[PDB]
Amino acid sequence: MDLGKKLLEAARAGQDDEVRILMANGADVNASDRWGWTPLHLAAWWGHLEIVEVLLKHGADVNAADLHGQTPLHLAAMVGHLEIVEVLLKYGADVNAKDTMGATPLHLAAQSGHLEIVEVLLKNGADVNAQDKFGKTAFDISIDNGNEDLAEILQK
Amino acid sequence: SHMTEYKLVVVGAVGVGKSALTIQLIQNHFVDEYDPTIEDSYRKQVVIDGETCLLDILDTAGQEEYSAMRDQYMRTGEGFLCVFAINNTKSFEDIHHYREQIKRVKDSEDVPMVLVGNKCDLPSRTVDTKQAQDLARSYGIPFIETSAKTRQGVDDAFYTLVREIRKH
Ligand SMILES: Nc1nc2c(ncn2[C@@H]2O[C@H](COP(=O)(O)OP(=O)(O)O)[C@@H](O)[C@H]2O)c(=O)[nH]1
């Protein structure tokens, strides 16, 4: 049994100590499942903050991209885990990483209506001018969805 | 006749109740009374909002991890039931993978979809209402609780997906 496989299991379950122990024994922190999700993707999607922190502290690739081209910041921003967004950015997460549809974390946060996450992404260099595969910006999403406070935030 | 046919695709992980939902819709009973090689209908005529139509169900059950055939099911379909079980955390997680894959095969950010939390007749769920509601709200899609066993929400789930197709 791969140590990386054990870490993915532990990371899904939010088992803080078991995560530390597998890392202490030499588990690949960037091990990925059949979808390309790493322990960091899992911890980000499920909102396991302390696991995000220890993974990053012990050299996890903050910009690891899955088979859909999504990074942990894409996931945290769409689902609405602010504190995880903040921590990922602090370790140099690419705030404008494009998935295989051309979507950035800002597109996903805008679509989800997480306004504080949108503001935190902008403060950390997110580009409102970034276009997805279909030529749409996060601003266009806010106009299409009729989300006026979002539109105002993106226009500044 | 001329009535509209809607091809509805059921996706989700193994064991969430995709075939149970399909059989409950078409045959009007649960797994316990389902007899394969007798009950072979994959279509049902229905009235949704006063307008008669034909539902054609494209169930991915048994081909979930057969990429080629799963993508062919998706490309053929017009709307998607993204089904998880309320007592399986991994199945909820997998929703995200299926939603992204549907967007890639159909090649649109806005594809008609419904989030379905199945097995709601069971008490002590491990994926709560709020968490599922928030994910659907983050996705901009309806969330519907279903039980293939009791029929609760089953028509609602399939009918709501037709209503999503009609207004795209
Ligand atoms: N209690 C309950 N059990 C269900 C429900 N739907 C499916 N099941 C059970 O869950 C298991 C998986 O159902 P199945 O339709 O084979 O899932 P599939 O792999 O997605 O097609 C079976 O044992 C079913 O009897 C439900 O709504 N309520």
Residue numbers in the entry:
A (entry chain B): 1 to 156
B (entry chain A): -1 to 166
Question: Which of the paper's sentences describe this entry?
Answer:
Members of the RAS family of oncogenic proteins are frequently mutated in human cancers. KRAS mutants are major drivers of cancers, such as colorectal, lung or pancreatic cancers. We report here the characterisation of two potent DARPins that selectively bind KRAS on a site of the allosteric lobe, encompassing histidine residue 95. The DARPin binding inhibits KRAS nucleotide exchange and KRAS dimerisation, thus impairing mutant KRAS–effector interactions and the downstream signalling pathways.
Biochemical analysis of the DARPins show K13 and K19 interact with KRAS independently of the nucleotide-bound state of the GTPase, and have Kds around 30 and 10 nM, respectively. The X-ray structure data of K13 and K19 in complex with KRASG12V show these DARPins bind to the allosteric lobe of KRAS, at the interface between helix α3/loop 7/helix α4. We conclude that the main driver for KRAS selectivity is the interaction between the H95 of KRAS with the W35 and W37 of the DARPins K13 and K19. The crystal structures show that when DARPins K13 or K19 bind to KRAS, a structural change appears in the KRAS molecule on the effector lobe, especially on the switch 1 and 2 when compared with two unbound KRASG12V-GDP structures. This difference is most likely due to their different crystal-packing environments. These contacts would cause a clash between K13 and SOScat for KRAS binding and indicate why K13 and K19 inhibit the nucleotide exchange of KRAS.
